[PDB]
Coordinates of C-alpha atoms in Angstrom, one line a residue:
Chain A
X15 CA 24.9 4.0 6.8
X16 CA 21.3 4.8 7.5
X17 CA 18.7 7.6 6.9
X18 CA 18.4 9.7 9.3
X19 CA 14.7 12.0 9.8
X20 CA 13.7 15.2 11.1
X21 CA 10.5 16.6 11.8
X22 CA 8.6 17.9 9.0
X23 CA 11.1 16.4 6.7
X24 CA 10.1 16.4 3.1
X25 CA 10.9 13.2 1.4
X26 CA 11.2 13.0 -2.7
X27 CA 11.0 10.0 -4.8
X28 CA 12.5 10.4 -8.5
X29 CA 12.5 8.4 -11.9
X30 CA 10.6 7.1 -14.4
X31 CA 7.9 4.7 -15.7
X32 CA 8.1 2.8 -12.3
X33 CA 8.2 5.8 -9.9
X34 CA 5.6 7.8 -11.6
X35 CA 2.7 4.9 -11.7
X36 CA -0.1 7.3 -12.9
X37 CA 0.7 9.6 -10.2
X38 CA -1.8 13.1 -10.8
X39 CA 0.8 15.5 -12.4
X40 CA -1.9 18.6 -10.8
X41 CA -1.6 17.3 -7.4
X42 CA 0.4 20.3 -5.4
X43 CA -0.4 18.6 -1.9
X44 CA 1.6 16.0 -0.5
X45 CA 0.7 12.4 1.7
X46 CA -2.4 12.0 -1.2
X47 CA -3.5 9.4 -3.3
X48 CA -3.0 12.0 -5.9
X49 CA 0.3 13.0 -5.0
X50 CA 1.9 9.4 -5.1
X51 CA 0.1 7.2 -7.9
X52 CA -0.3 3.7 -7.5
X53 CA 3.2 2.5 -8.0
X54 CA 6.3 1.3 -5.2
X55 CA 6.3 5.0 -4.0
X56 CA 2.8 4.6 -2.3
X57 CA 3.6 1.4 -0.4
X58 CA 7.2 3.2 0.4
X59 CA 5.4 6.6 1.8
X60 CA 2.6 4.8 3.5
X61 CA 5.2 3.0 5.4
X62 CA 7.1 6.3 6.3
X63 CA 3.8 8.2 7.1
X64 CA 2.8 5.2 9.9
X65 CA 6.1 4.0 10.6
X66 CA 8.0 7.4 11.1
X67 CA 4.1 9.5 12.0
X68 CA 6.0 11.1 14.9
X69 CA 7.9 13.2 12.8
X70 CA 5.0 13.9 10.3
X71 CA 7.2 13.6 7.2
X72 CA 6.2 15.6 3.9
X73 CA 6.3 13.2 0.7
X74 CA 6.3 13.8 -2.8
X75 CA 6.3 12.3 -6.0
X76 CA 8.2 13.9 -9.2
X77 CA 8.7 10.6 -11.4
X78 CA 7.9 10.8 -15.2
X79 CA 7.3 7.6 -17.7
X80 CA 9.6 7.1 -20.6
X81 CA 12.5 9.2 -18.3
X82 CA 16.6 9.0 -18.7
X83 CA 18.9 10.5 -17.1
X84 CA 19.1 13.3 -19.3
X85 CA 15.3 13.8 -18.9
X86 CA 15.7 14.4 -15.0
X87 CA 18.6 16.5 -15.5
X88 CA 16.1 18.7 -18.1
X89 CA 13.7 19.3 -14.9
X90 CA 15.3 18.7 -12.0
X91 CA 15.5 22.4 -11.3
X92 CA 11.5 22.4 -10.7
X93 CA 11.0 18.7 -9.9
X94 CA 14.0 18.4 -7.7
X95 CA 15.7 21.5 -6.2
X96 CA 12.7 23.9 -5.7
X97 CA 11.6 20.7 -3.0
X98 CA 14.6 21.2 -0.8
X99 CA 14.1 17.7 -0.2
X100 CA 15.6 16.2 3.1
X101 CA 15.7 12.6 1.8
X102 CA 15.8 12.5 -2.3
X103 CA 15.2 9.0 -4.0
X104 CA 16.4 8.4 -7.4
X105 CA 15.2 5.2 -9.5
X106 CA 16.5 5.7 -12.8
X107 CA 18.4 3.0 -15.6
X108 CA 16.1 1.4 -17.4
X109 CA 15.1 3.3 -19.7
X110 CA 18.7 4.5 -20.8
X111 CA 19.1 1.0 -21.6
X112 CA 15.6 0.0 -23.1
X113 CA 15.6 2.9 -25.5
X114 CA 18.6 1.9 -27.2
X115 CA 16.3 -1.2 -28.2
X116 CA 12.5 0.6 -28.6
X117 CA 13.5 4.2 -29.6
X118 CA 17.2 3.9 -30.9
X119 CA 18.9 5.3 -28.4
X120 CA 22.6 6.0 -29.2
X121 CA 23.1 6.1 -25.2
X122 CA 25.5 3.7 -23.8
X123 CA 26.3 2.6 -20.3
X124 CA 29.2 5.2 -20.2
X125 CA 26.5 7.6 -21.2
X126 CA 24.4 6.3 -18.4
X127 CA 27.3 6.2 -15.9
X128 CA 28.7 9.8 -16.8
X129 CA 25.1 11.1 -16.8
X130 CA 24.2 10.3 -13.5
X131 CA 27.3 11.1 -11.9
X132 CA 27.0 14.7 -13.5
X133 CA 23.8 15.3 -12.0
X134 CA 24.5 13.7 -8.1
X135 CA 27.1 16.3 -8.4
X136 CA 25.0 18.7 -9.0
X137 CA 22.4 17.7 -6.7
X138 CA 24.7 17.3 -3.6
X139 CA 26.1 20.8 -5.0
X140 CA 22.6 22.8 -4.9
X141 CA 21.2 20.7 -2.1
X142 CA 24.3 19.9 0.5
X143 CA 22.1 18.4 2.7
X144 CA 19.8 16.3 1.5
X145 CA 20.4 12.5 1.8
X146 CA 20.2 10.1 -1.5
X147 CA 18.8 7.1 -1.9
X148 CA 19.8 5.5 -5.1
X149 CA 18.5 2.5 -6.1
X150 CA 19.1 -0.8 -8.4
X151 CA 17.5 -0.7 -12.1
X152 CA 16.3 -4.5 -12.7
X153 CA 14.9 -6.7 -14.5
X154 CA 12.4 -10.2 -14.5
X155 CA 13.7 -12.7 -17.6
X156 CA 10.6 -14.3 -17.8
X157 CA 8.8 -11.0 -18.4
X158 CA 7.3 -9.8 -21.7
X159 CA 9.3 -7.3 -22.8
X160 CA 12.7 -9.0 -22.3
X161 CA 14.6 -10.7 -25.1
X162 CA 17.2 -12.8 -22.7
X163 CA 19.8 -12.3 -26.2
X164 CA 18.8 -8.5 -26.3
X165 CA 19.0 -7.6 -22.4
X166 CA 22.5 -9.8 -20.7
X167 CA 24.6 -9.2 -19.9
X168 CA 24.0 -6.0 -21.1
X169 CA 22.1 -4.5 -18.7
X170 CA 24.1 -5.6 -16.0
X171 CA 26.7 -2.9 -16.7
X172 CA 23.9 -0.6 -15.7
X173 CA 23.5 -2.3 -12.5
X174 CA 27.2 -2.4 -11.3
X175 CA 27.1 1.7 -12.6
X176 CA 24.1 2.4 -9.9
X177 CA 26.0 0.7 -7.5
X178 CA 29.8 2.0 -8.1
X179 CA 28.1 5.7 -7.9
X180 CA 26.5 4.9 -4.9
X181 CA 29.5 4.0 -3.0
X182 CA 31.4 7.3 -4.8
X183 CA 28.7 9.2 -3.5
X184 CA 28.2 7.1 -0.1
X185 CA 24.5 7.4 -0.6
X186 CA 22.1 4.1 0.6
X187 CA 21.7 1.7 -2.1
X188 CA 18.5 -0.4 -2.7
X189 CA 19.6 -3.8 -4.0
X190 CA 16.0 -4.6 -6.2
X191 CA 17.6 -7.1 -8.5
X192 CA 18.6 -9.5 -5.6
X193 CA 15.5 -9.1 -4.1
X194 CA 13.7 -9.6 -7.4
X195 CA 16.2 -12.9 -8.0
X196 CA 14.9 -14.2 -5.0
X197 CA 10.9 -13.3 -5.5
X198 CA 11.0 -15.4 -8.7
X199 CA 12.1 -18.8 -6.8
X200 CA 9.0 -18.0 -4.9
X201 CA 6.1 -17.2 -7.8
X202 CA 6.6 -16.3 -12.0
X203 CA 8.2 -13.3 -12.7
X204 CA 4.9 -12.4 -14.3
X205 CA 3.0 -12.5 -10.7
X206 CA 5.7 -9.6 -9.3
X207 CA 5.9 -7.8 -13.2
X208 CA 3.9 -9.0 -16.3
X209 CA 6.4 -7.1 -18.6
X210 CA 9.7 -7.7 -16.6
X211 CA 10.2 -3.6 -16.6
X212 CA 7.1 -2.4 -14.8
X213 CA 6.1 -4.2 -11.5
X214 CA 2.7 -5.2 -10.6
X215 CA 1.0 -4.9 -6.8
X216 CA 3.8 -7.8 -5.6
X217 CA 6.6 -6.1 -6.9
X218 CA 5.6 -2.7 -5.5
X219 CA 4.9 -3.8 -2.1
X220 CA 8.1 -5.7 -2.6
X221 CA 10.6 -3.1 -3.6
X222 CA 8.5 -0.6 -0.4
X223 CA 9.8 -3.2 2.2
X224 CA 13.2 -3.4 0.5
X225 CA 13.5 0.4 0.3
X226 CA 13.0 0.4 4.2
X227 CA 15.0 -1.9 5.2
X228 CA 18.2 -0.5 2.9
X229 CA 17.7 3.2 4.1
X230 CA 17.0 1.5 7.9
X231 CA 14.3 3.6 8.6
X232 CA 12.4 -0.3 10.1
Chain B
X20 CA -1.7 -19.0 19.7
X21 CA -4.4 -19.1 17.1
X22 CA -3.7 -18.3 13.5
X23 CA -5.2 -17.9 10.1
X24 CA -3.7 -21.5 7.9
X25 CA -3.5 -20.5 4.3
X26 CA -3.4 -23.2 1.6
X27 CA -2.1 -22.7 -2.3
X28 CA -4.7 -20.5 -4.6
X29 CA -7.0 -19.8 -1.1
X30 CA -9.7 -16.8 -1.8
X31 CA -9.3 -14.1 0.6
X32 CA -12.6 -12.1 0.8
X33 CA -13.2 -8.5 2.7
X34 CA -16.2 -7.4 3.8
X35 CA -17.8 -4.3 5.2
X36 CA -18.9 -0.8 4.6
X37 CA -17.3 2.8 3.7
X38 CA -13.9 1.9 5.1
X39 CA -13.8 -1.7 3.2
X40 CA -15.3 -0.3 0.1
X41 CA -12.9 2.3 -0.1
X42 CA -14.0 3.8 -3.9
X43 CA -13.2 -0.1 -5.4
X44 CA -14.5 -1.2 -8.7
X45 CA -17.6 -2.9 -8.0
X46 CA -17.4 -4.1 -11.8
X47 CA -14.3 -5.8 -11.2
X48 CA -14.3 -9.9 -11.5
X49 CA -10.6 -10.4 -11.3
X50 CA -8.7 -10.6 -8.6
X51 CA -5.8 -9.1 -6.7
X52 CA -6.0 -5.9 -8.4
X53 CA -6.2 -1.9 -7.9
X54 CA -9.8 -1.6 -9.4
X55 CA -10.4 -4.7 -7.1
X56 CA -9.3 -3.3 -4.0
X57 CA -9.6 0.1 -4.4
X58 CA -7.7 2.6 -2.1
X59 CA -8.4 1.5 1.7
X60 CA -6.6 -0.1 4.7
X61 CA -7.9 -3.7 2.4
X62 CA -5.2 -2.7 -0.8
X63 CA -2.7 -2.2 1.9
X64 CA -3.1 -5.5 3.8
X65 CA -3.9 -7.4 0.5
X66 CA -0.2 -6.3 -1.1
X67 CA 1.4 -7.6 2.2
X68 CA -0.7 -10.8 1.7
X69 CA 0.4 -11.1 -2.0
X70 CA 4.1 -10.4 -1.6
X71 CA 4.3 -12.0 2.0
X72 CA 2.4 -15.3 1.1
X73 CA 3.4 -15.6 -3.1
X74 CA 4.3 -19.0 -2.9
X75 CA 0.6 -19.7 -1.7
X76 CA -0.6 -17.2 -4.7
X77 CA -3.7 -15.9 -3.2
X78 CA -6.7 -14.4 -4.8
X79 CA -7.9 -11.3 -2.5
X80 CA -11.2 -9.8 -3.5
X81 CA -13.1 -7.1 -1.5
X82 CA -17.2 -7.3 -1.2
X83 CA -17.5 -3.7 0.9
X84 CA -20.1 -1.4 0.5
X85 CA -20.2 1.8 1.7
X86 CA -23.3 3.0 4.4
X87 CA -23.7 -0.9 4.8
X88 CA -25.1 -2.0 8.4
X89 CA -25.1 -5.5 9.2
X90 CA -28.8 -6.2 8.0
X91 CA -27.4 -4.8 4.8
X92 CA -24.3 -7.5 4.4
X93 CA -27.2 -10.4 5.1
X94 CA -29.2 -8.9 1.8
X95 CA -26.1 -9.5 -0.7
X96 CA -24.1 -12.1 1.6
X97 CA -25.4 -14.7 -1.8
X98 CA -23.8 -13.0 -4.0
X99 CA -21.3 -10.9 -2.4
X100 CA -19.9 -13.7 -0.4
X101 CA -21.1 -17.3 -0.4
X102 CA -20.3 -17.5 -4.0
X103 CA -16.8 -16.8 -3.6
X104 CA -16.2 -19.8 -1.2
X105 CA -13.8 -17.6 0.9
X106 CA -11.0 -19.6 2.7
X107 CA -10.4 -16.2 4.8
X108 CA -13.6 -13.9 5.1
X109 CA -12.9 -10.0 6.7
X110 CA -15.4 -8.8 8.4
X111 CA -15.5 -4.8 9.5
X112 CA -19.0 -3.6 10.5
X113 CA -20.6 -1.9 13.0
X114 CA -19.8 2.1 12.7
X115 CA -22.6 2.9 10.6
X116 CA -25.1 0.7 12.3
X117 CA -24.4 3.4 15.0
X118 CA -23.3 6.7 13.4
X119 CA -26.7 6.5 10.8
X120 CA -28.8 6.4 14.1
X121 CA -27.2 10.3 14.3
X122 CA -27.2 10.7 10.2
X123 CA -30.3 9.1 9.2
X124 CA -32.4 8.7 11.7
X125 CA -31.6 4.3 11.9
X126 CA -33.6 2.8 14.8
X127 CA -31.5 0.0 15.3
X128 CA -30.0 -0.2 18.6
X129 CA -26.8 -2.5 19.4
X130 CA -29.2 -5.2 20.5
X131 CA -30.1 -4.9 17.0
X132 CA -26.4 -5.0 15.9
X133 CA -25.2 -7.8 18.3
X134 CA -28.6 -10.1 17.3
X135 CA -28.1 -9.0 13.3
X136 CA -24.0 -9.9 13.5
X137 CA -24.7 -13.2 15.5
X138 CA -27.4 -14.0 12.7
X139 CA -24.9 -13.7 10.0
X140 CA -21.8 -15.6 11.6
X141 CA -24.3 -18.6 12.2
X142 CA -25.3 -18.8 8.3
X143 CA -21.8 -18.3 7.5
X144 CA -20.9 -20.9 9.3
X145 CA -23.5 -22.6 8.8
X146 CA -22.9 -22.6 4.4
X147 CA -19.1 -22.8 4.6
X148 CA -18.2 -24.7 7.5
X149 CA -14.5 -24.2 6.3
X150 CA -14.3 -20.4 6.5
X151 CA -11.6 -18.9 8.7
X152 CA -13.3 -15.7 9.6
X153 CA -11.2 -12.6 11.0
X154 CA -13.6 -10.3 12.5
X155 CA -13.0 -6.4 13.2
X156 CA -13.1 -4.1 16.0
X157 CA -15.6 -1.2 14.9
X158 CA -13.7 2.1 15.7
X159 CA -13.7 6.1 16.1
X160 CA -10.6 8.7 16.6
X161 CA -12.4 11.0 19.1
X162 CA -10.6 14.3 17.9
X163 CA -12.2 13.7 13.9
X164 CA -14.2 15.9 12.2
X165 CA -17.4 13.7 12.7
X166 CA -17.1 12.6 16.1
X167 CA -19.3 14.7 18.8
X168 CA -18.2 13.1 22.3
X169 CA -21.7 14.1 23.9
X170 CA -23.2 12.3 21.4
X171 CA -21.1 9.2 20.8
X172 CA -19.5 7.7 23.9
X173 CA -19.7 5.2 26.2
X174 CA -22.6 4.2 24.1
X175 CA -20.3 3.4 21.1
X176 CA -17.9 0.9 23.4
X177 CA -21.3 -1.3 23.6
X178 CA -20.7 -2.2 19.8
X179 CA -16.8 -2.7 20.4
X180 CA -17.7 -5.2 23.6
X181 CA -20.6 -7.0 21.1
X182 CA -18.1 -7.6 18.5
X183 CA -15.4 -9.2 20.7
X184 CA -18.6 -11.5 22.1
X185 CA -19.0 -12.6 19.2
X186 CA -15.4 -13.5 18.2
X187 CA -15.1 -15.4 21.4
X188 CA -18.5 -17.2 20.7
X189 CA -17.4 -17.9 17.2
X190 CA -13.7 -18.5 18.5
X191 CA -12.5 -16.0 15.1
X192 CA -9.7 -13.7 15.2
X193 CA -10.1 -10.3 16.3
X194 CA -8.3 -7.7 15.0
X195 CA -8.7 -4.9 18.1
X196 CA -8.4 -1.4 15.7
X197 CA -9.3 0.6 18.7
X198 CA -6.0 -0.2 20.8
X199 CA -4.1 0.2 18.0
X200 CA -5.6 4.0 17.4
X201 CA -6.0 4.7 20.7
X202 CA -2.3 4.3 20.6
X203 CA -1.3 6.2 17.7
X204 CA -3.2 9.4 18.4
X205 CA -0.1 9.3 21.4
X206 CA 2.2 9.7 18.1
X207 CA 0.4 11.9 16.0
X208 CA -2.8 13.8 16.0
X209 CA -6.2 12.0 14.8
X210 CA -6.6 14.3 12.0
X211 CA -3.5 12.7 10.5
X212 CA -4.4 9.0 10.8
X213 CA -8.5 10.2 9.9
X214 CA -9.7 13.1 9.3
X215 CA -13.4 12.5 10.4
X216 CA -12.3 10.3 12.7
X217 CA -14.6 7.2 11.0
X218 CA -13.0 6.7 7.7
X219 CA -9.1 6.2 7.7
X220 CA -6.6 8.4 5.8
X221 CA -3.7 6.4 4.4
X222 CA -1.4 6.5 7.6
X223 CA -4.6 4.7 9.1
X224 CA -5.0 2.1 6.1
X225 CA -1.2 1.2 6.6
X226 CA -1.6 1.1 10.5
X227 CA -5.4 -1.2 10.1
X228 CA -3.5 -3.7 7.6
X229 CA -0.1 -4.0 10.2
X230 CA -2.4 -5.2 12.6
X231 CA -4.6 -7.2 10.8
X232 CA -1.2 -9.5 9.2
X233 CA -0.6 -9.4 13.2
X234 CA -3.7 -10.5 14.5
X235 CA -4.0 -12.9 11.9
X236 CA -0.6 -14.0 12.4
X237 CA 0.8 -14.1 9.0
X238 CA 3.8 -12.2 9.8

């Protein structure tokens, strides 16, 4: 499986802390600064906007900090559908796992897994064309935030979840966590991610060439 | 074929004007970050650098300065560059030290340019014998907002031919931006890579870093 792109296509990137990135919530125009943030989505869309220029691809960013899957589902008519997005990316997990720790969550990983299930239903429902690309919630061990006793194997759960849905719903998986398994023989965890959740200008530029290779679009 | 050799912990430094500069933080005195950086075709190149090469952990820093000519790179090349012992010095200039002859009224011609540039390599040289320098093609998308055809070319490809010279005098790299537009525009409009056809938009950042890891060879 591979993406496949139109002309004028309109690409969407979904999620949370990580997708966001300080991204202007004001910005209405897409291929900006403004409109992407700083995070993996600008490295992803750059890519796409050289790589695939040809086809002068639209490309937004609707990803909010602090987001679950129950948080998307509360805005994904405005920040999802009204985009009629030809290519939607979804980068969500961390959080619904996280929160049970920081905010105390009652959300469990059948919460997680029924959630998002719920709402690619939906979203293949309401959009039947648009393509998904659903990618891996990870982690970095030797980050800040993670407490090895409090995270695994866990969180892994979480991972296997993202992945079983993705074959369910045949969409392109992005395999981070293997990628970020293998970026850690090469430097600290701390040079790719200081807190373990939240990559730094390595990581982003990291998970970007991972997301292109995945969907095949080079 | 001739490559850029990086060691562990080597100091990558970029230098230049508004396209270098790129709206960086000219307060920042760390290393491989956004404020560092800033938003041009050097954030773009430097991520590739620091996710490519991480087992080398570089430290990329960007000197740029925007409506800088040459002469102007010479007056803070203390401070803005010897000091930082770069293993891997950028160099992108020549644009301005054409376009302000148009703008503000600059009487330097490219003799001026070509003398000024070979100047500067020489010292470089000259205090860190060591550097690896990676010099850039100056460039223009013809179809920008700023670009007047009548009043920019062929005299503009003089400062293109200077600036391969003086790579082959200095036996540098050369990253050739020109060939790499004038092939692009073939894709897509100019207005979509740059919109005033002098500073690059980010499809043009992307394309400038892709072919400065290529003519640098690091992948």
């Amino acid at each position: 499986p591979k993406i496949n792109l139109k002309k004028d296509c309109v690409i969407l990137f979904q999620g949370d802390s990580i997708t966001d990135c300080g991204r202007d919530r004001n910005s209405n125009r897409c291929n900006t600064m403004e409109q992407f943030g700083s995070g993996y989505v600008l490295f992803t869309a750059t890519q796409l906007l050289e790589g695939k220029a040809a086809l002068q691809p639209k490309i937004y960013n609707r990803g909010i900090s602090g987001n679950k899957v129950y948080q998307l589902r509360e805005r994904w008519e405005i920040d999802c559908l009204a985009f009629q997005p030809d290519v939607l990316s979804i980068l969500i997990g961390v959080n619904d796992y996280w929160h049970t720790l920081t905010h105390g969550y009652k959300g469990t990983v059948e919460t997680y897994e029924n959630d998002l299930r719920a709402l690619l239903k939906y979203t293949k429902e309401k959009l039947p064309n648009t393509q998904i690309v659903l990618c891996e919630p990870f982690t970095l061990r030797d980050g800040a935030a993670i407490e090895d006793s409090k995270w695994y194997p866990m969180f892994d759960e979480f991972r296997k979840s993202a992945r079983k849905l993705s074959e369910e719903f045949n969409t392109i998986f992005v395999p981070f966590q293997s990628g970020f398994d293998a970026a850690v023989k090469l430097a600290p965890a701390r040079y790719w991610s200081n807190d373990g959740v939240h990559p730094d200008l390595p990581g982003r530029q990291l998970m970007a060439n991972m997301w292109m290779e995945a969907t095949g679009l080079k």
